Symmetry: C3
Subunit: 38 residues, 3 copies
């Protein structure tokens, strides 16, 4: 099992990071919207 668990671990860490950036993106898009609007 080791190869499989090490690749799964890494893919999961990538996926968590992607989720985190999607959140940062939403907040940034909010800020853009405020600069476009006001």
């Amino acid at each position: 099992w080791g190869s499989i668990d090490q690749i799964n671990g890494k893919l999961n860490r990538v996926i968590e990071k992607f989720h985190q950036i999607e959140k940062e993106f939403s907040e940034v898009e909010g800020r853009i919207q405020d600069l476009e609007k006001y």
Copy 2:
């Protein structure tokens, strides 16, 4: 089955990344718009 799920999970990761790539390109273009007009 393992190489199979692995493949599956990488492909999920690769699709996410492309969307990320696309979202980033869209933000930066809005930023340009504001900076130049």
Copy 3:
């Protein structure tokens, strides 16, 4: 992909790329700050 070596190789190439997108985003975030700052 056929092998763990090759999956990890491709994952690594994503991670390298993503590394670069993060730097670009941070620079963009600073640009928003500047625009907010006015």
